[PDB]
Amino acid sequence: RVQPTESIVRFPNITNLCPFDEVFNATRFASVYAWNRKRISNCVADYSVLYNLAPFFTFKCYGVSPTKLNDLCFTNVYADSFVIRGDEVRQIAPGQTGNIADYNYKLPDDFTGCVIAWNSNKLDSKVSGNYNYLYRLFRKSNLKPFERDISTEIYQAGNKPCNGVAGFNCYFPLRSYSFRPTYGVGHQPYRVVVLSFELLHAPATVCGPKKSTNLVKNKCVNFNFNGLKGTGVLTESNKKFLPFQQFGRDIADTTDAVRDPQTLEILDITPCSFGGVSVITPGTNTSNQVAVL
């Protein structure tokens, strides 16, 4: 049998990727209390760009390895974007207790996701200072995991009725967050986006980009065209498939032709040459010379 010289993997041109870049580079990020939610589906996700960029220094991933994130397939990916101070960045972790964590964004202990935080002092800080960002400071009970509260009702800290007026014992729950360039790194604003990965009964719609290799023809090579795995010799084929049709089979039901995903050309697959070996020999007593068929 002729063993396969090389292995070639062919997959369709990468397309339809969800706008991770847009959410990461969004000009304005929502306040932590009103954290935005992004739904990712029917897309191919490449995380190489996020890792490559210098600004995204923090890439802490819990429950899954970031390197194999592309390899692993997740039905739905959820992206939430909020800006928080450096001191409280630690609080956004599984099983971590903090003011931001308890009253703004809550992560369950069993959370499979990667949290991405990048310091963005220039964008979020002004010489005058930026008071647009707000954080919840007063809440009756700790927030449940992945729960968003936007209530502006005046907090009641006293027996006397609040009356809807923020008097003594009544304080507005949201507190303005102050950012300046001169402020220390801990006080300095950090943009944080956490990606949550989940698996559902419905077929996964989000998966990492599929790698491809150069086509090899007229040689015996292992082939993986669109998930069809076989060992064969690939040749140009006269036969023309219908547009929907991807691969072809003979009467025996063995695959005989495949259409390349990247280039729509039908290629015949022929099994690598194999045959029986027969030794033609005169009697051993007469001679030891042999001929092989």
Binding site: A252, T254, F274, G275, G276
Partner: protein, 49 residues
């Protein structure tokens, strides 16, 4: 699939030559070729026998 057809040792042309030899003997030698060396006989006399 590992299933192979092995060619016959005697080719069709060779079989035809054997058949031709049998026909030639029967027409010219009658039944003698079967029982021994071919013996010439006229075909009408062979039919008479």
């Amino acid at each position: 699939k590992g299933l192979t057809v092995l060619p016959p040792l005697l080719t069709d042309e060779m079989i035809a030559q054997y058949t031709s030899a049998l026909l030639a003997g029967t027409i010219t030698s009658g039944w003698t070729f079967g029982a021994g060396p071919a013996l010439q006989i006229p075909f009408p006399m062979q039919m008479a026998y």
